Amino acid sequence: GKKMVVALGGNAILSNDASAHAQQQALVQTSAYLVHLIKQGHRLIVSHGNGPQVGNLLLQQQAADSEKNPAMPLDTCVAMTQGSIGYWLSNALNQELNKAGIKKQVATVLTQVVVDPADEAFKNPTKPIGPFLTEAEAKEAMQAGAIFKEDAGRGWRKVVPSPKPIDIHEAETINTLIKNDIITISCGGGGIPVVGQELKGVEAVIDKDFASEKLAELVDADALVILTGVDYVCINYGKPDEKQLTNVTVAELEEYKQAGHFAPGSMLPKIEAAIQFVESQPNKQAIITSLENLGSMSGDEIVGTVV
Amino acid sequence: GKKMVVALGGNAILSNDASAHAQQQALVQTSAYLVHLIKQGHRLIVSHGNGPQVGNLLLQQQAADSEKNPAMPLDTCVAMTQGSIGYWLSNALNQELNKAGIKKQVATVLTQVVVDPADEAFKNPTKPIGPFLTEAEAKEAMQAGAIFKEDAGRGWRKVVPSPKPIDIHEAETINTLIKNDIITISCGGGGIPVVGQELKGVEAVIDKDFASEKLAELVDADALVILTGVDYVCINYGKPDEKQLTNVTVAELEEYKQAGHFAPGSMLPKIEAAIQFVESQPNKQAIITSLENLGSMSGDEIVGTVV
Structure with missing residues (x-):
């Protein structure tokens, strides 16, 4: 069925207890929701952020910094988070698939994402x-x-710095795995920040949403799923103008955007990514909702479109 | 041509400087040797250890251990080394392939290797x-x-503890990648130590040689390449009996083995792994030599066989 790129949030994976066990435990629930989409015949293309995970690791790198045990630069740290989180997620998905009686294979691929060295983000x-x-x-x-x-x-x-994704090096391999009906986990932590033809690693952390957005393009997915804690995007929240968005056109999102309705921290990037994806190809769509909502499914929340 | 499983040593990658840069730099040279095998039309199935890498990481985990930033258990640490080392190696291979004008894809897959919970290794x-x-x-x-x-x-x-590999969970995915002519890097650090049907992670580190040996089986490779700092196995080294094995039979190795020639710490595992591989299928062979020697190639060193 539909090829869906789901971007799991690192802050969601580590929303409370920062222990490996707690995170893996959390991933069991999310896996339950994901497997539900599989039951519906959809093709899952999973990705994930690493915000808190990489920060903690970076601290660990600094805590023992020495000649004999030198700190691994941020790019290498991201790769490690791809390994840890990847491992957890993959193990969780297997558990849930096994339990659900579904026999699909899951594989995490280390992903190097190319970025423009002249990106303004390197200054900001x-x-x-x-x-x-x-x-x-x-x-x-x-x-x-x-x-x-x-x-x-x-x-x-x-x-x-969070530079924008320009290209996904392993895109071809990922696509191949998808064509062989394998649930792929890629672009871990937004992908290992890389630059140039030589793919020189740089110190930065790419936003999962935009990385997933590029993946969706290169992979020609049908829908890009942007996760949020609540199903439906609210505007004027605590105000008497509170409204859910449900079905919206890119033009409609732009209206709200220009009217400063989306906070630059979280919501803005979500909307921008969504808009960008829909505008890339004719018959594409972006969804913004809770993972728990996807775990239910029928007529889902926030569908950004233009066709 | 021949499908070869090459096991890179973690202690080789980190033989001196423990900095990410130094290791990556070392991997560039190894990549050159590996690419040489590709020029000869061989199929590369790469793997690697993580001995020093994982120990340093583990220390880092301990250095900042706290409720807010807890240490990741060994199993998760191995996963992180699969990410770091994998990243380095993949990047290096890409560089060398690109330079050599060869257009092959490289992909690292997180590998979970099943082991027996009642393995004596858990006590030793x-x-x-x-x-x-x-x-x-x-x-x-x-x-x-x-x-x-x-x-x-x-x-x-x-x-x-170094339990023996029983099964490689991602074997099917790996094999698929191989069939698509993609240079795979798997079983990083001997593979994430897992137990049971649920794939419950355990605290341990599997030997790269034995993990690669299992990979070779499940992947039906033609030859298993065990790396050593020297080309040809020399029994009675500094003694007047110094001899090169060149071409040997499993039986011969078993005879040399009984005489306690191969040090239990390094050489013994090499020999055992080689013998086990050759004895698994009729037309198989194991090679023990320097990576630098493979970089040259023609009539290579130490070929263990029986057919």
């Missing part, structure tokens, strides 16, 4: 990475050669 | 992991609930 570190720190701790680490930004309500986090 | 930690420590530091860490073993000449290292 924005990707919130790791745990929340007090302004005090933020200062303590800030002077070590790092930039932090505040999230009103919980604290400060280290910000990193 | 043997796999040397991480850096060399003085007996003093060994004692300091030993009482933390860890076992260490000495290597006369350089120091002590933390030992971990």
Whole structure:
């Protein structure tokens, strides 16, 4: 059936307890929802972020930094998160598929995503990475050669550059796996940031949503699934103008966008990615909803289109 | 041509400088040798160990251990090394292929290898992991609930259980990739140690040689390449009996074996793996030589056979 690229959130995987067990445990539930789509005859093309995971790992790299045990640069850290999270997800999916009696194979592929070295993002570190720190701790680490930004309500986090995806090196192999009916997990953590023909690794963390967006293109998927904690995109939330979006046209999204309805932090990137995907090919669509909502399915939430 | 499973050593990748750069740099040279085999029309099925890489990572896990940033258990650590080392190797191969004008695709697949929970290895930690420590530091860490073993000449290292491979979960996917002429990198770090139908992760590190041996079986490769720092196996080295084996029979190796010639720490596993492979199928062969020697090629060193 429909080829769907689902982008799992790293902050969702690690929304509370930061222990491997807790994260794997969380992935069991998400896998249950994913397998549900498989029961419906859809083709799953899974991806995932790594925000908190990579930050914690980066800290671990710094904690023992020495000649004998040197810290692995961010690009290499992303690769490690592809391994860890990949492992967890794949194990979870297998468990759920096995239980559901469905016999599909799952494979995670290390993905190197090319980016433009002249990307403005390299000047503007924005990707919130790791745990929340007090302004005090933020200062303590800030002077070590790092930039932090505040999230009103919980604290400060280290910000990193998030360049836009230009090309997915392993795209061909991924596509081949898809053609052989294998559930693929790729573009882990937005993909290992790489630049140039030599694919020189750079220090950054790409946004899962935009990486998934490119994958959807190169893979010619039918739908791009952007995850959110709530089903339906709300506008003017606490205000008396509260409205769900349900069925929307790209033009309609642009209207709301121009009217500053989407927060630059989370919602804006979601909308932009959605719009970009739909505008890439004639018969394509983007969906924005809760994974739990997909676990139910019938007539789903937020469908961005133009045709 | 011949399908060859080559097992790269983690200690070879990290033989000196422990920095990501130094290791990647080392992988460029190895990639050159590997690409040479491709020029000869051979099919490459690459694998690799992670001994030093995983130990350093494990230490990093311990250095920041806390509720907010907990240590990832060994199984998850192996997964991370599959990601890091995989990334490095894939990147390097790409570079060398591109340079050599050869257009082949390279893909690393996260591999979960099944083992027997009742394996004697779980009682006998043997796999040397991480850096060399003085007996003093060994004692300091030993009482933390860890076992260490000495290597006369350089120091002590933390030992971990090395259960034998029973099955490779992603074998089917790997084989598919091979049939599509894609250079696969799998069984990273001997593979993520897993147990049972549920694939419950266990704390251990599988030997690359034995993992590659299983891969060779399930993949039906023509030859298993076991790497050594030297071309040709030399029994009675510095003695007046120094002899090269060149071409040998399993029986002959078993005879040389009984005489306790091959050191249990390195050479013994090499020989055992080779013998086991050749004895699995009628027209199979195992090779033991330097990667640099393969980089030359013609009439290669140490060919174990029986047919």
